[PDB]
Design a protein around this motif. Structure first.
Motif, mmCIF file in Angstrom:
data_model
loop_
_atom_site.group_PDB
_atom_site.id
_atom_site.type_symbol
_atom_site.label_atom_id
_atom_site.label_comp_id
_atom_site.label_asym_id
_atom_site.label_seq_id
_atom_site.Cartn_x
_atom_site.Cartn_y
_atom_site.Cartn_z
ATOM 1 N N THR A 1 -0.380 -34.027 18.679
ATOM 2 C CA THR A 1 -0.170 -35.457 18.460
ATOM 3 C C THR A 1 0.586 -36.067 19.639
ATOM 4 O O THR A 1 0.205 -37.122 20.174
ATOM 5 C CB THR A 1 0.628 -35.723 17.173
ATOM 6 O OG1 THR A 1 0.039 -35.009 16.081
ATOM 7 C CG2 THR A 1 0.643 -37.209 16.859
ATOM 8 N N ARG A 2 1.665 -35.394 20.031
ATOM 9 C CA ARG A 2 2.434 -35.787 21.203
ATOM 10 C C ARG A 2 1.542 -35.827 22.441
ATOM 11 O O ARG A 2 1.604 -36.773 23.232
ATOM 12 C CB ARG A 2 3.593 -34.817 21.427
ATOM 13 C CG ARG A 2 4.313 -34.993 22.755
ATOM 14 C CD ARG A 2 5.376 -33.927 22.940
ATOM 15 N NE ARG A 2 4.852 -32.590 22.669
ATOM 16 C CZ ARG A 2 4.148 -31.865 23.536
ATOM 17 N NH1 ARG A 2 3.871 -32.347 24.740
ATOM 18 N NH2 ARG A 2 3.713 -30.658 23.194
ATOM 19 N N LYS A 3 0.698 -34.809 22.589
ATOM 20 C CA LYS A 3 -0.199 -34.736 23.736
ATOM 21 C C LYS A 3 -1.205 -35.877 23.750
ATOM 22 O O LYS A 3 -1.568 -36.367 24.809
ATOM 23 C CB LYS A 3 -0.919 -33.386 23.795
ATOM 24 C CG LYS A 3 -0.232 -32.387 24.700
ATOM 25 C CD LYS A 3 -0.825 -30.998 24.586
ATOM 26 C CE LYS A 3 0.009 -30.017 25.393
ATOM 27 N NZ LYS A 3 -0.248 -28.610 25.001
ATOM 28 N N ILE A 4 -1.652 -36.306 22.578
ATOM 29 C CA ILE A 4 -2.606 -37.402 22.507
ATOM 30 C C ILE A 4 -1.942 -38.730 22.856
ATOM 31 O O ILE A 4 -2.445 -39.480 23.698
ATOM 32 C CB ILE A 4 -3.249 -37.516 21.115
ATOM 33 C CG1 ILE A 4 -4.218 -36.355 20.875
ATOM 34 C CG2 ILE A 4 -3.970 -38.848 20.976
ATOM 35 C CD1 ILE A 4 -5.402 -36.340 21.819
ATOM 36 N N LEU B 1 -6.886 -36.826 28.818
ATOM 37 C CA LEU B 1 -7.583 -36.508 27.576
ATOM 38 C C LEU B 1 -8.271 -37.761 27.043
ATOM 39 O O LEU B 1 -9.379 -37.699 26.522
ATOM 40 C CB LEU B 1 -6.618 -35.974 26.521
ATOM 41 C CG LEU B 1 -5.864 -34.679 26.794
ATOM 42 C CD1 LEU B 1 -4.978 -34.357 25.601
ATOM 43 C CD2 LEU B 1 -6.848 -33.554 27.057
ATOM 44 N N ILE B 2 -7.598 -38.900 27.175
ATOM 45 C CA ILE B 2 -8.140 -40.177 26.729
ATOM 46 C C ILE B 2 -7.927 -41.217 27.821
ATOM 47 O O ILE B 2 -6.903 -41.198 28.502
ATOM 48 C CB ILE B 2 -7.424 -40.685 25.459
ATOM 49 C CG1 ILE B 2 -7.326 -39.590 24.395
ATOM 50 C CG2 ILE B 2 -8.129 -41.917 24.903
ATOM 51 C CD1 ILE B 2 -8.652 -39.227 23.760
ATOM 52 N N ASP B 3 -8.887 -42.121 27.994
ATOM 53 C CA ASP B 3 -8.667 -43.260 28.874
ATOM 54 C C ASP B 3 -8.172 -44.391 27.984
ATOM 55 O O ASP B 3 -8.940 -44.985 27.224
ATOM 56 C CB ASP B 3 -9.974 -43.655 29.570
ATOM 57 C CG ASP B 3 -9.781 -44.738 30.622
ATOM 58 O OD1 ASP B 3 -8.730 -45.412 30.620
ATOM 59 O OD2 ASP B 3 -10.698 -44.931 31.449
ATOM 60 N N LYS B 4 -6.882 -44.691 28.094
ATOM 61 C CA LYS B 4 -6.256 -45.703 27.249
ATOM 62 C C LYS B 4 -6.410 -47.119 27.790
ATOM 63 O O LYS B 4 -6.313 -48.089 27.038
ATOM 64 C CB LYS B 4 -4.793 -45.351 26.988
ATOM 65 C CG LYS B 4 -4.633 -43.942 26.424
ATOM 66 C CD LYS B 4 -3.407 -43.797 25.546
ATOM 67 C CE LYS B 4 -3.462 -42.490 24.768
ATOM 68 N NZ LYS B 4 -2.367 -42.401 23.765
ATOM 69 N N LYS B 5 -6.634 -47.236 29.095
ATOM 70 C CA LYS B 5 -6.789 -48.543 29.723
ATOM 71 C C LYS B 5 -8.189 -49.104 29.504
ATOM 72 O O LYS B 5 -8.365 -50.313 29.353
ATOM 73 C CB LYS B 5 -6.435 -48.491 31.210
ATOM 74 C CG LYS B 5 -4.954 -48.225 31.469
ATOM 75 C CD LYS B 5 -4.590 -48.423 32.931
ATOM 76 C CE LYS B 5 -4.816 -49.868 33.358
ATOM 77 N NZ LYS B 5 -4.037 -50.835 32.528
ATOM 78 N N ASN B 6 -9.184 -48.224 29.489
ATOM 79 C CA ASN B 6 -10.528 -48.623 29.094
ATOM 80 C C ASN B 6 -11.035 -47.709 27.982
ATOM 81 O O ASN B 6 -11.361 -46.549 28.221
ATOM 82 C CB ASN B 6 -11.467 -48.553 30.297
ATOM 83 C CG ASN B 6 -12.867 -49.038 29.972
ATOM 84 O OD1 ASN B 6 -13.103 -49.642 28.923
ATOM 85 N ND2 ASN B 6 -13.804 -48.784 30.880
ATOM 86 N N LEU B 7 -11.149 -48.253 26.775
ATOM 87 C CA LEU B 7 -11.419 -47.431 25.601
ATOM 88 C C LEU B 7 -12.864 -46.983 25.493
ATOM 89 O O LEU B 7 -13.138 -45.857 25.083
ATOM 90 C CB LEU B 7 -11.040 -48.170 24.318
ATOM 91 C CG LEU B 7 -9.583 -48.155 23.886
ATOM 92 C CD1 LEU B 7 -9.466 -48.824 22.534
ATOM 93 C CD2 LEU B 7 -9.076 -46.729 23.819
#
Ligand code: ATP
Ligand code: MG
Length: 839
Positions: free
Chosen positions: A88-91, A111-117
């Motif tokens: 969870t922390r890693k996400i 792991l995830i692109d948070k700026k472009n979903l």
């Protein structure tokens, strides 16, 4: 694009069989496939890993070799010592991994692109076939970039979703969001690392912006499972805080947030800043998550790159342990009860920082003292979370004067109307339009807050005229040893609280944890009187009986409608100061801590006491104005009131008991020693419509005993006595068992019994009825004790013996049989056992 829809057209059924789990799953997979979710067939963790490899490589524009990928896997993505918490922390935080390739170059792997979903890759898989024969477990897992972030458990149409909930390879540690459906009802909840899990009450339906529920799986999918919507819920609208607990925002919260954000963007684009029309306010009923929501809104507001600074402003009055512990990560030691602007000024000059957390007092002080700040000329966002009228007017005047470009937003459970204004300007005038609302009505409908049980306890003929006094002048003039503080009155009240405490807090049943309570008194002298009387009486009872177990009682008050009490203890007079000193002394003696009465030591006392009331280390907390507003204590079920409470103050005070916990907490208990009925109804009516009182307030003892009819759907609810009657008639044990039909009916009926009794334990009449069942005999001496303690006439006493209840042994037999039928069902669709109640 709002992910909580203003307008949504309910989807039509396909006509195909919707009965089984396989039907729901088939149509779910198809729907998701139409929404852009690729279905990959992945039957193993190795396959999952391969896919994750491909998706991460595509996302980051990078390529792993077998050695490099194995290393990334072992060190970051899949390391074995990682738990759910770690994932969870890693996400949410650590999602960027700096990776050294074998050629020694460094690249940042997301792991995830948070700026472009939408760049993130979304896929779906179904359950693995496992091994020999157990089954069923029909699930659909939504993978983001290969990572299994969402899990949908499916049940057939008949299954009650609540019981389905009650029923429950390393990559699945990454699971964030859970969704469960029988297809009629769909409920989502966060994954947790707890060691004490949440209850069903915390699960949420998806909804439109008007708060109307979206239940059936098809609509849930058409709305909540849209890639944009879902990815936003996972990334932006999920909260991982300093307590390392995952909180998924309820729809109304998200709606308020995104509406604020859009409001800011539109106001900036039009250069419409610094008016009320550039701002907004949020009406969310007390206890509905205003703090979490407003703070998340500020945080997200910092992501607007045209915005220079975002103020998150709170009242010190609304502060407690966890909140202050949380704000530390942003503006360290700048959030407290002092008047000091130094920390704030340090936050203002802090590089790589937008978010600034502070108190309305400190902000007002800063605005007074400092003439020309750089931030005055910047692009500013103010997020106000439940700021009481105390410093707010002055702070607003200075704010309007000094800040040139700003967008300000209010958050409140009790807006200021003309009716309750009392010298203060209306919320509407200050913040302009209402960007969203979640009323106490909707909140009770969604069961995200608890109803009130409000009773004026009138056993005291001598003081009744006073307690019922309407005239405000007489009221104010009545606080003293002559009228309200009269030693006999205080003694009687205190004695009542001592006698009924475990009853009101559900500590009655043997081996029950239960809840705790507060006592809101009228003045500092009232606090003194009560603390002293409690001490005296607990001592007396301890001397009478050696078995008696005392209640740990603490108190806090300061200098000082609820008057704001400062954190400066030098403003208090010597007597109050002495009493506070002694109280803190005893607190220190018992909890083995050292707290002084100097402002710093008193603030430490405030925080520690908050934490100890929250965790039930303290049984009863005596306050005047303190801990009546923003205090969050889900395990506090009872507010004892000898105080004058009106309108907003009344709502906020009563709402300390409103937090949802589990099936054991049915509603909040408000026991008042002055008559608050008129004040209660006026307040509730102001914050709702004429009918709100018929929702917020609980039913009568007589109604729950004999049965009553609910206004909403017309459902006739059976009485407790009817349930008892039918239990004796249809099942007087053990021979009603073994047959399955009788088993089911018994489970249902006794379920009603459990819920009914659990509700009834909060009623003094039920307490009296149950107490009457010892006694005996005669031995009068045994009768006068019971009568004087339970305030019962000879007439009432004679009538109470007519009432016939099942023996404790028969009830325990029913409970063990219930437990055995529960244990028997593992290896009946609509049945729901009460799990929490049996605990
Ligand atoms: N989305 C959510 N998921 C799970 N729990 C939540 C969520 N939102 C709020 N809560 C819980 O509800 C409780 C109340 O939240 P919060 O303290 O923000 O209420 P509030 O409206 O700010 O308080 P008050 O109105 O009494 O000042 C908290 O214990 C919080 O953990
Ligand atoms: Mg709040």
């Amino acid at each position: 694009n709002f992910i909580v829809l203003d307008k949504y057209i309910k989807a039509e059924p396909t006509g195909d069989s919707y009965q089984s789990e396989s039907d729901l799953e088939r149509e779910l997979i198809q729907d998701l496939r139409n929404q852009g979710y690729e279905f990959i067939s992945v039957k193993s963790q190795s396959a999952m890993l391969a896919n994750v490899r491909e998706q991460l490589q595509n996302l980051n524009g990078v390529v792993f070799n077998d050695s490099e990928w194995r290393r990334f896997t072992e060190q970051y993505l899949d390391n074995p010592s990682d738990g759910i918490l770690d994932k969870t922390r890693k996400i949410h935080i650590d999602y960027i991994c700096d990776f050294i390739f074998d050629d020694e170059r460094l690249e940042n792997i997301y792991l995830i692109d948070k700026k472009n979903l939408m760049r993130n890759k979304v896929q779906i898989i179904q359950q693995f076939e496992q091994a020999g024969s157990h089954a069923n477990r029909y699930d659909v897992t939504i993978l983001v970039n290969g990572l299994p972030l969402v899990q949908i458990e499916l049940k057939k149409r008949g299954v009650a979703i609540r019981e389905a909930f009650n029923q429950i390879n390393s990559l699945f540690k990454y699971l964030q969001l859970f969704v469960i459906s029988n297809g009629t009802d769909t409920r989502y909840f966060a994954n947790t690392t707890k060691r004490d899990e949440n209850s069903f009450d915390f699960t949420m339906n998806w909804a439109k912006s008007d708060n109307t529920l979206i239940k059936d799986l098809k609509d849930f999918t058409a709305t909540c499972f849209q890639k944009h919507t879902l990815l936003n819920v996972l990334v932006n609208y999920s909260v991982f805080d300093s307590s390392q607990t995952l909180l998924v925002m309820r729809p109304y919260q998200i709606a308020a947030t995104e509406r604020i954000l859009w409001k800011i963007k539109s106001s900036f684009t039009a250069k419409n800043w610094s008016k009320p029309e550039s701002g907004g306010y949020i009406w969310h009923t007390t206890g509905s998550g205003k703090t979490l929501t407003s703070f998340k809104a500020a945080r997200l507001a910092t992501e607007l790159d045209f915005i220079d600074k975002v103020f998150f402003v709170v009242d010190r009055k609304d502060l407690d342990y966890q909140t202050m512990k949380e704000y530390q990560r942003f503006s360290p030691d700048s959030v407290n009860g002092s008047e000091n602007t130094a920390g704030l000024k340090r936050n203002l000059d802090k590089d790589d920082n937008k978010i600034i957390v502070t108190t309305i007092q400190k902000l007002n002080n800063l605005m007074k003292a400092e003439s020309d700040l750089p931030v005055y000329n910047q692009q500013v966002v103010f997020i106000f979370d439940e700021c009481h009228r105390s410093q707010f007017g002055e702070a607003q005047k200075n704010l309007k004067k000094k800040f040139k470009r700003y967008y300000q937003f209010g958050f409140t459970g009790t807006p200021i109307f003309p009716e309750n204004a009392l010298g203060s300007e209306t919320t509407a005038s200050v913040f302009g339009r209402e960007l969203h609302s979640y009323v106490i009505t909707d909140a009770i409908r969604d069961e995200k807050v608890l109803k009130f049980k409000v009773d004026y306890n009138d056993v005291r003929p001598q003081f009744k005229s006073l307690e019922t006094e309407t005239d405000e002048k007489k009221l104010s003039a009545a606080e003293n040893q002559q009228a309200f503080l009269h030693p006999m009155r205080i003694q009687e009240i205190t004695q009542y609280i001592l006698n009924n405490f475990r009853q009101k807090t559900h500590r009655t049943f043997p081996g029950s944890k239960g809840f705790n309570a507060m006592l809101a008194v009228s003045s500092v002298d009232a606090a003194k009187a009560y603390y002293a009387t409690f001490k005296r009486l607990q001592e007396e009872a301890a001397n009478k009986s050696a078995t008696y177990k005392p209640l740990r009682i603490a108190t806090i008050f300061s200098f000082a409608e609820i008057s704001d009490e400062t954190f400066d203890t030098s403003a208090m007079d010597s007597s109050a100061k002495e009493f506070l000193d002694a109280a803190i002394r005893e607190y220190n003696s018992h909890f083995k801590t050292n707290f002084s009465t100097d402002s710093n030591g008193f603030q430490n006392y405030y925080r520690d006491l908050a934490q100890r009331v929250k965790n039930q280390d303290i049984d009863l907390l005596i306050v005047v104005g303190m801990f009546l507003t923003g205090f969050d204590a889900p395990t506090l079920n009872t507010l004892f009131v000898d105080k004058n409470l009106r309108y907003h103050g009344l709502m906020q005070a009563f709402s300390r008991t409103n937090r949802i916990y589990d099936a054991t907490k049915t509603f909040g208990n408000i026991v008042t020693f002055r008559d608050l009925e008129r004040s209660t109804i006026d307040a509730i009516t102001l914050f709702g419509d004429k009918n709100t009182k018929n929702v917020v307030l609980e039913k009568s003892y007589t109604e729950y005993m004999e049965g009553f009819t609910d206004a909403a759907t017309g459902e006739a609810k059976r009485g407790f006595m009817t349930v008892v009657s039918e239990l004796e008639q249809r099942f007087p044990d053990p021979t009603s068992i073994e047959s399955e039909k009788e088993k089911k009916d018994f489970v249902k009926l006794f379920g009603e019994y459990l819920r009914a009794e659990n509700i009834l334990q909060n009623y003094d009449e039920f307490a009296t009825l149950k107490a009457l069942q010892q006694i005996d005999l005669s031995d009068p001496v045994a009768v006068e004790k019971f009568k004087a303690e339970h305030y019962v006439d000879d007439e009432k006493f004679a009538e109470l013996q007519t009432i016939r209840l099942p023996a404790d042994r028969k009830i325990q037999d029913y409970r063990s049989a219930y437990n055995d039928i529960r244990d028997w069902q593992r290896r009946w669709d609509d049945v729901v056992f009460e799990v929490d109640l049996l605990k």
